[PDB]
């Protein structure tokens, strides 16, 4: 029942600042320090700093002047704030808790927060069906999918039939198009005979633009 | 800061084999090293703390050793679900630092891709763009060629590929090739074909459709 949940992924403009909330449960901020760790293309896993039980903070050397960590013990919330972001601050940001109150053995992690630094605007995606067909069958097995196109920034979550359908699902890594917008597909293979009985819906969520689309996918 | 070097960057083993991850430190760090597993879309998962100590919920097949500068993360009998990245962390010296990681991939028998092609939806054609998608599903090894042809014209530069990480259950990959066209170009031609080449196919497989049917 120990958990850390972070605020949603988002875009930040160059030189602007980054704010993330880590809400914890199954323990008390008065008893444990919360650490912040990011993971970037440039530097991999990188420890950023910590807020201790009693409110003291330590910040990693290159972040002394642009990092502030605060908390609200009663609300079980820890607040991370970093100023003056540049492109190479694009990274997944994590809060984490150690096993023991004073240590650095990170046993519990938040789900991460993908932060993109860019001057671009947020754009929600269009969802298009990848319809099952004769040219999409294979010995009693049909492939079908969703094309999630022209969004920014990453990430987008896709699930099938509201979480209920997982077997045979592949959600591909997003590719960056020349437009500078991203695109990905998510596919699933199902029995051909279930195409008449079962409904198939990809649930698309692009949190940075708050775009939620449920796309029904049918034989054409 | 203490530099941690993980070697090699990539490990490829068959299931049931033993596998060692190496992590070397730029000066002695005693036994103050922790190891993590990171799966696709996952947060780091703590496997071993202080070089050799167990963690609740981590399978017994994971263990670690070493002291001073040379450490080993061991999986004695590797399973398909161990497909992940593995990191080491030192905390003998402030600030705690992480190695750059080692990728663990599994070997398995050759598996030919199942191939499926999808015309652009009429929905998308309204927007003025056409995407043609070719899916290569559940194959091994990763290397594959997708060739696009429109009315026998070779397509080049106007497609993009994405490949899933290795599946944790069956150790296969899947690949999508998206050919992108203007609607105008799309409505100007009839035959859309993707030809797939792979080690598991005795000859290339072509999936095609005619715009319309």
């Amino acid at each position: 029942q120990v958990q850390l949940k972070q605020s949603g992924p988002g875009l930040v403009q160059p030189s602007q600042s980054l704010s993330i909330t880590c809400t914890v449960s199954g323990f008390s901020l008065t008893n444990y320090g919360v650490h912040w760790v990011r993971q970037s293309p440039g530097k991999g896993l990188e420890w950023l700093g910590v807020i201790w039980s009693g409110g003291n903070t330590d910040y990693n050397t290159p972040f002394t002047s642009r990092l502030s960590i605060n908390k609200d013990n009663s609300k079980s919330q820890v607040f991370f704030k970093m100023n003056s972001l540049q492109s190479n601050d694009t990274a997944i940001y994590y809060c984490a808790r150690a096993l023991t109150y004073y240590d650095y053995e990170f046993a519990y992690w938040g789900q991460g927060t993908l932060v993109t630094v860019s001057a671009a605007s947020t754009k929600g995606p269009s969802v298009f069906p990848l319809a099952p067909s004769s040219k999409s069958t294979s010995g009693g097995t049909a492939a079908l999918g969703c094309l999630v196109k022209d969004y920014f920034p990453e990430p987008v979550t896709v699930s099938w039939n509201s979480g209920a359908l997982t077997s045979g699902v592949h959600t591909f890594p997003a590719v960056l198009q020349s437009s500078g917008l991203y695109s990905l597909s998510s596919v699933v293979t199902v029995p051909s005979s279930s195409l008449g009985t079962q409904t198939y819906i990809c649930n698309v969520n692009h949190k940075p633009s708050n775009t939620k689309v449920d796309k029904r996918v049918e034989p054409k | 800061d203490i530099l941690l070097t993980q070697s090699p960057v990539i490990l490829s083993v068959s299931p049931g084999e033993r596998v060692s991850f190496s992590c070397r430190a730029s000066q002695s760090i005693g036994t103050n090293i922790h190891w993590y597993q990171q799966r696709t879309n996952g947060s780091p998962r703590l496997l071993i703390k202080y070089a050799s100590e167990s963690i609740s919920g981590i399978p017994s097949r994971f263990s670690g050793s070493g002291s001073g500068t040379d450490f080993t993360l061991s999986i004695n009998s590797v399973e398909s679900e161990d497909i992940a990245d593995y990191y080491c962390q030192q905390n003998n010296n402030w600030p705690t630092t992480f190695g750059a990681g080692t990728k663990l991939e599994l070997k398995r028998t050759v598996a030919a891709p199942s191939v499926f092609i999808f015309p652009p939806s009429d929905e998308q054609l309204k927007s003025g763009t056409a995407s043609v998608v070719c899916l290569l599903n559940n194959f091994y090894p990763r290397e594959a060629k997708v060739q696009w042809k429109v009315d026998n014209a070779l397509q080049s530069g106007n497609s993009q590929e994405s490949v899933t990480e290795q599946d944790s259950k069956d150790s296969t990959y899947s690949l999508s090739s998206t050919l992108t066209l203007s609607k105008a170009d799309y409505e100007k031609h009839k035959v859309y074909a993707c030809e797939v080449t792979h080690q598991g196919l005795s000859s290339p497989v072509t999936k095609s459709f005619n715009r319309g049917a």
Binding site: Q39, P41, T90, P173 | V9, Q38, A100
Partner: peptide
């Protein structure tokens, strides 16, 4: 060898 944004995994 490096962390990939689209993948959340190491890629080369």
């Amino acid at each position: 060898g490096q962390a990939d944004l689209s993948t959340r995994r190491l890629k080369g």
